[PDB]
Each structure stands twice: as C-alpha cells, then as structure tokens.
From a paper:
The receptor tyrosine kinase EphA2 interacts with ephrin (Efn) ligands to mediate bi‐directional signals that drive cellular sorting processes during tissue development. The Eph extracellular domain (ECD) consists of four subdomains: the ligand‐binding domain (LBD), the cysteine‐rich domain (CRD) that includes a sushi domain and an epidermal‐growth‐factor (EGF)‐like domain (Arora et al., 2023), the N‐terminal fibronectin‐3 domain (FN1), and the C‐terminal fibronectin‐3 domain (FN2). Efn ligands bind to the LBD and sterically seed clusters of Eph ECDs, which then drive forward signaling through tyrosine autophosphorylation of the Eph intracellular domains (ICDs). To elucidate the details of the mechanisms of Eph receptor clustering and activation, we developed a panel of synthetic Abs targeting the ECD subdomains of EphA2, and produced monovalent Fabs and bivalent IgGs to either negatively or positively modulate signaling.
Utilizing an alternative Fab framework optimized for crystallization (Bruce et al., 2023, 2024), we were able to capture an additional crystal lattice packing arrangement that revealed the anticipated higher order protomer complex of Fab L1 and LBD‐CRD, albeit at a lower resolution of 4.6 Å. Molecular replacement of the lattice revealed a structure with one Fab L1 bound to two LBD‐CRD molecules with a solvent content of 65%. In this structure, a single Fab engaged an LL/CC dimer of EphA2 in the asymmetric unit (ASU) as observed in all closed forward‐signaling‐competent structures. Evaluation of the symmetrically related molecules revealed an LL′ interface critical to forming this lattice of symmetrically related complexes, resulting in a 2:4 Fab‐EphA2 biological unit. Importantly, the tandem LL and LL′ interfaces observed in forward signaling complexes enable EphA2 protomers to further polymerize as was observed in the 1:2 L1‐EphA2 lattice. Therefore, we concluded that L1 IgGs induce the same cross‐linked tetravalent cluster as is achieved by Efns, by stably bridging a dimer (LL′) of dimers (LL/CC) with either one or potentially two L1 IgG co‐engagements.
Residue numbers in the entry:
A (entry chain B): 2 to 32, 39 to 58, 66 to 72, 74 to 80, 83 to 111, 115 to 220, 223 to 232
B (entry chain A): 1 to 9, 11 to 35, 40 to 64, 67 to 72, 74 to 139, 141 to 240
C (entry chain C): 27 to 315, 323 to 327
D (entry chain F): 27 to 238, 241 to 327
The structure:
Amino acid sequence: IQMTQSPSSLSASVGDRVTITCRASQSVSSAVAWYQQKPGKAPKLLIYSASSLYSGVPSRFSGSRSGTDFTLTISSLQPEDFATYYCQQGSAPFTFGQGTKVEIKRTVAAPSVFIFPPSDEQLKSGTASVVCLLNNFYPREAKVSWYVDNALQSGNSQESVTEQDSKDSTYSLSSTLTLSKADYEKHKVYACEVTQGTTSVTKSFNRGEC
Amino acid sequence: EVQLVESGGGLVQPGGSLRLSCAASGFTISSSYIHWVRQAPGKGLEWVASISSYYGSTSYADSVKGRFTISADTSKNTAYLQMNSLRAEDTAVYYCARSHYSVWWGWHSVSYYAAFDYWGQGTLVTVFNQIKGPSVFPLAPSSKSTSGGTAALGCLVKDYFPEPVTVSWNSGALTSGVHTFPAVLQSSGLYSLSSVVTVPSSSLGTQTYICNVNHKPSNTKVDKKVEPKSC
Amino acid sequence: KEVVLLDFAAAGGELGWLTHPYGKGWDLMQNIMNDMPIYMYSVCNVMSGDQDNWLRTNWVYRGEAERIFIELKFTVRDCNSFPGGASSCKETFNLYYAESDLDYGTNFQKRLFTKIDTIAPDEITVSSDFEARHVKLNVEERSVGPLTRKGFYLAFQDIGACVALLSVRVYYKKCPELLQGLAHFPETIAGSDAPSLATVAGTCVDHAVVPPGGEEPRMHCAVDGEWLVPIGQCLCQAGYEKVEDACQACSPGFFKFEASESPCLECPEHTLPSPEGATSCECEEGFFRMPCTL
Amino acid sequence: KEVVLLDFAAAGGELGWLTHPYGKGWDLMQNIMNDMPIYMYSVCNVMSGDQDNWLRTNWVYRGEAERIFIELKFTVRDCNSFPGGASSCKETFNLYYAESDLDYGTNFQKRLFTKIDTIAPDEITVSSDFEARHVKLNVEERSVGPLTRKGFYLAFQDIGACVALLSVRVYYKKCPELLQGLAHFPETIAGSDAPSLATVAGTCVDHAVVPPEEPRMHCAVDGEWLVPIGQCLCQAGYEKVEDACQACSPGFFKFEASESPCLECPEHTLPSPEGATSCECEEGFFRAPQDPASMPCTL
Ligand SMILES: [Mg+2]
Ligand SMILES: [Mg+2]
C-alpha cells in the first residue's frame, strides 16, 4: 500500500476554501486520519476515522472522501493552523502522509533591506562574509543580487528564508556573500540589490568608511 | 492527563548505539499500542516500530528492520527503542505516541479509537562525527544601520557542526523583532546561521546588546556583544 | 416460516446491549470497508485470566413466541497464536438466558441468568499478522423453550477468549398458511418440543363443503414450523368441480350432482345440454327421469 | 424406544479401539472407584501443542438403523490449572464419523473422516490437583443421518486437551408397538430427520373390525407414534373390556360393530346369551319388521 499526496505545496488567501487529497493507492481499509505538523513542533491530532473530528478542533476541518480519495477540507481560515498537513492510514502500516505545505497570504509588504560588512575579527581568519537582510517582507518571491564594484556575483551567495511570522505574516531572507581576505580588501564598494516586483532597492557600503 | 515524554537524545558515532525512552503518563500502555515516528530534516513523517505490551506483538519497517528494537517494561509504563548501527540517514527527531489495538483487521474501537491522539514532543538523535565549535562575529550597526529611529544589529554563527544552535539575545530578554535564521550548509560542510534583532537607533549608544550563542553539541557557550564600528 | 425477533445486523450494535465489566471487557467494534457500517462485539483478554466479561442484549418482546432459536455467527482466534497465553487462555464462550415480564436494562444481575450451553467454534482463526487478515465464520445454533414471561434476555459470558461476535439472530417458527385440500388453513405458531401442536382446522374454499359423513379438515402444525398429516378435507359441492385449489362451476354441458372434488360428469343419454354449473341434469324435452328414461 | 448399537461400559475397552499416534496420545486407563467405575480413555498432552491425536472405535454393525444418536460422557480439565499451557492448551475436541460397508480395524488412514462438530464441556472439571477431585461429568448428544452403508466408524480428534472419555453410547429410535385403537401397530424403525410422512398401519385385534379408513399411526424421528388416522371397532357381539374386545355377558347383545358397550336385550325378548349379536325373541313376542335387535321384540 502506497499513500500519496497532492499538491506538494500551496498558498492561498485568508477566507479561502482549501482541499488536499491522500490517494490510497491500494485498499488500505477505510479508516484514515489527517494531521498537521508545525515545523519544529509536536504534532496534534486534527481528524480521524475519515470523519471523526478530534474534540475541540475547529469545525472547519472536515473528513471528506471519494473512494480512495481520502481528503481534508477547511471552511475559510482562522487564527491558528497553516502548517504542512499530513494524512495517515489507520490500517496496520500506519504510514503517515508525505505532507502538503500550506501558506497564508498577506498584502504585499515593505521589504526593508539592511547590509553588514565583515567584522574585524573575521578578516584575520582569511574569510569575508557579507550579510544582506530582508526583514518582514511579503511575498518571499524576490530577486537578490550582489554587486562587488558593479559586477554581479554568482555562486558565492547563500539564501535562507525563515518561517512565516504569526502576527504580521511576514518573511525574512538572508543573503550571505562569502569571500576571502585577499579578495575583500582588494575591492572598495559592495552593494546588495533586491528586486521585488517593480521596485529595486539596493543598500551598499564602502570598506574605508564607518 | 494523558502525557508522553521522550528522553535519550544526543550525538552518537556512526554505527553507535543509543537508547530512547518514552515515559507514559495518565494511561495504561496495556490498553493501547505504542508507536515511534521519526522526522528527517526537511522531509515528512516515517513510522518506525510498534509494540503491544499487553500482547507483546511487534512490527518494524524495512528501513530499520532488524537494526531497531522496541521494548515495553510494562511494570513502569515505559517504552524503549534501542537503535544499533545508526546510519547517517537515521538522523532525525523521534516521536512516540499511542493508539488502540483492535485485534480484528479493519475493525476499530468505536468507544476508544482516536488515531494517534496523544503525542510526545521530539528528541534529536544526531548521527555524525565531525564536531566544530561555533565561530561568532558581531554584525555592527553603523552609519548604514543608523537610518531612522529604528536600527538593525545581529550576530553571525559561522562554520559549526553539528546542529542545533540556540541563540538568545541579552540573556533572553530581547525577544521582540528577533528573527533567528535557519542554517545553510555551506560548501565547506559546516552549517551557518545568522541571528538579527531590530532595535531603535536611539538605544545603540545607551543600551548594550549581547547575543548568547549556545552550541551544546560542542559544550560551547559564546557571549558576544555587538559594538558599533564607529572607528 | 420464521418470524424474526432480534437481529444484530440491523442497527448499530442493534442500537443497544450492555457490557457488565464497565468499560473494560466487551467493547462494540465496527468496520467501514464500504458504505455499509458493520457493527460487531469483541473481547480479547487472553493474557490475563480471571475474566468475567459479560454482554447482555436488550429486552426482546416475547409476543406469541413459544420456542426461540439462536443463530450466532462468530470467529475465534487460536489461543495459541498469542505467545503468553500461559494458563489463562480459553476458546469457548457460555450462552445464557433470563426470562422476565418487564424490561430492566443496565441492572444486569450476574445471579439471575440460566445457562443454555457452552458454545465453541468449529473453525479457529489462525493468521500471521496480528490484525488477522481474513476470516473464518463459525455458525452454530441452539434453542431454548418453552418461554413463559412477557420477554427475555440473552447473555454472553467470556472467560478470557479472543472471540469475534458478528451476528445474533433470535427467531421462532410458524406454520405458513396452507391452502391445499380445498381448505384454507391459517398460519399458526410452532411448539416447544415433540408436540402435536394445535392441529388447526381448515376453512372450506369457495363452493367446497365437507362430506356429510366425513371428518372435518385438520392439519397438525409441528415444532419445526411445518404443517403435517392432513386429516379430513373439503370437497367441491354439487354443481362444482375441482379446478386447481378452488371449486369451479361445471362448464356448459356438464353436471356435478355428486358433491365431490371429482371432475364434472358428462350429461347422460338423451338430455338437453345442462347449463353452466349444473347439479343433477334437468331432463330433456319429452324425456322424464342417469339417462332420462326414454 | 432405543436400540443400543455401541457401549463403552460393557467390555474392557469394548475389547478394542485404536490409538493412531502409536503409543503416545490416547491411552486406555482404569480406576477402582466406589465399587467398579472402570475402563476409561484419556489424553493429557498440554505442554506440547501441535497435537494430532486420534482414537478410532470398532466397526459398529448398522442393522436397521437409519438415524444414529451419540451420547458422550466426559470430563475436561481446566487448561489453566497446569502452569505451562503457554499457547499449547485448548479445551475442545472434534468428533468425526465415517460410513463404511466393511469392517477394517487398525487402518485409520487420516483423510477420509467426516466431522460432526467441535464439542466443548458446559462444565469444566476444575481442581487444584492432578488427580480429579469429584468430577463434573459433561453429557452432550449429537445425531447424524441418514446412513447408507452396512455400518459406520466413530473418531475422536484431540488437539492437546486433558480430557477423560468415560462413556460412548450409540442408539437409534424405534416406535414401541402400540395397541390403542383396537389395532396392533408393530414396532418399526425411525426416520432420518424430516421424515415421518409414513402411516404404518395397525392390525385389527380379535373381534375388532374397521367400519365398512383403517387405523394408521405415524412413526417419527424421535421414536414417537403420532396422529392416529382411522380405527378398529369391536365387532357385533363384543365389547371393549380394557384393550381387548370381550364377548357380551349373558343377557347382553351387540347388534353391530360399534364402540358402544354390550346392549341388554330390550323387552319382549329373552336376555340375549353370552356374546350375542341379535336379541332372541320371546314366546309369541316377535321382532317387528322395522324393529332391530336394539328394539323390543313387539308382542
Ligand atoms: Mg455443549
Ligand atoms: Mg459446528
């Protein structure tokens, strides 16, 4: 028996009806369950028996099913939830679902940008790691570019995006330009361009300035 | 009342042996099964083992078949999992849970079925060898970060192994606006995460800021203060 | 025929039934393999012993029932497929019954229950998987009678067996309204044991009359619900003949003065064709009264 | 009635019976209780499991039997009173049967044996001691029919229970020679299960005659006659005394075959002599043309 899910991930606005289906490839009884696991948190039961709602769980969650199309549905949206949602078959294998990353929407926010040069102590080790920050912005979709003396840098950047904030539903991205001591000290001006939508903001610095 | 607690995590050598224990509270493990579910970093949930302390019936997945063993000391309401020959793939967070037994195929306890109703919290079993103390640098606010009544400073955690790194600012008092970034596995093979906090620029010269990087996998406790470059 | 007094596969848990050892012990089970929920009761307390698990059914209304029959469909695990059944595992359940004039409910008194017999499976459910992948349906049947009160209770006592109760039927037999012999015999009830039970007489069908020097129609209903041994009969009256199981008028040109089921006798010599349904043949024009004496 | 076809408490092992699993398994035992409760079979292989022990009886001669009845008397240990019955102890035995035209003996060849039902005790012999401590003799009864061959075989399958076979009775029912209704109904055989539907007739006893239907009684599966149809009537000159027609006493007559007792000579007729059918007239008194023997011989 091979439990499968679709879609792998999705994003929707507040007040939107959503559905994710767990395709039971073989007839693994009919007792199934749907859960939802917060990234980096202990899971909680959402619904079981393919219809039995866990006592206290909000009424929007519903155990719909069409043959082997065991699936979950939410009415619109309320304060909690919004995680990667997993199903599970109640038969002997207990093989849980592969998950579906759901996402709350947010009015396109202000992507404030900051930049930090490598510190004094790091240069003595022979490495320079420039930092560019995107704080409380939406959507994550953007274009981050590094310009060392008006030359686009490719490959020497690492991007990390945090999880959605609870209050303002905002992201946080970090671009890390990693260089060497000989290469950092041989250039002068370093800039970080962020191209979100139509606006292209770029923060910069100079080595001989503080 | 019905509580499940897991303990026994840490770092063990590749091929080493670890023991994890699930302490059951508020219920008798005789009237329910015990499960172990692991979660690989960035992937979904995977079922590992089951046990039937009233009946003694067991079951394992072919991922860990033979290598992993589940036990239940029915005298202390405790279940164990003894992992041998830990592989680099086996590194995950191991949860424990309960469910009813329902000895007949497809039949489930109408009065006492709640599929995996109660759960544990998560314990990490790092299966690695390389150990790297965390290198910490300040992210100094400056003429760039002076802009406005709001400033931005942070700390950089570079070239450490293995995870996790717990970051707190000013002994955990500065929490508002703190965005602790996930690590990125660099080409060197060591993870790297950066922690930043947004504070007013009026407090830069009067309020000192210290980040507390803690890397218990290496027994390191780094306290770094972020000082404006000024120069 | 059979008049069903109780079926478990009609409502969820028959929408009732008690578990004496409170929550523990017997527990009503169910599977939804399809869009037809199938309710069932079970107990699997093999590795403990000292087991007094009970399951009492709801008060069935006796009505006109005199002997009730009990048809259980069940499966039983191996008592051996579970390592650890050391001197605590049995494979038989005991079937009880109690007779009451008033429904009590939820006040099951261990004492007041007479036992019928200890049932046992004729096929043992053996399987490698703990869930017991397939099934082996045992079918055994008992009866208890005669019944006296306005109702009864059924009980199921377990001593630590892994049994799977799938259905419980309680019915009584009834003789199903025969109509043969030109007599309409009404449908009657069965008896207790080896009886001559209520040899219900018949009702002469249309235009059928019992012969003057003859016994009245009577048929002996039996315990199994089968009619038996016809004694007496109804016979088609004068002017009528036995067509199927109803007396029919003689066709034109035929007569039936002799009141009997025998077919219509033909008009004798030298006689006007007697009209439909004729009795003794009206003689013919000029012929005076068997052939009308010429 | 009951015609017994096999009894275990008649000869030592009925001088026979086979144990298929060679020496092991069923073994004939014996004790000397109150005066002579002796001759018993048992098996107590609880701590082994995977048990296929059999016991075959000797070929019983069917005779006129059409439905045979089997009455077993046995006791069963607890399966729980012996520490060590771990997943090897059950408390039920399976009863089989085979129909054969030839006596074979010593040839149980383990395939061709049809099963009746898996029996189990309704009371379990329980005691905290290996030697049974006042027993509870279970008594259960099955029947199988109809039979086709000149005989049959019985079998006893055990799966590792501590059971004590004490008796085995095999009988068939027979309707026991009734005489009511002035008809001699012979003793006849029973039917299969449904059967009845037969009207085994009677024999009109001396001075009993069927009125110008004959008496018939339905022999049944249980061994009971049923639903008499027709009857015999004491003939002229005879009266029903007990269950036999007896001659009319002196001074009495019986004109016709009827259930009525002997009639006394009415009047103007000398008392009809012993066993008389018609009333002899008196001197000058004559039986009027319409007057029958019942009506006085009008002077
Ligand atoms: Mg019995
Ligand atoms: Mg049977």
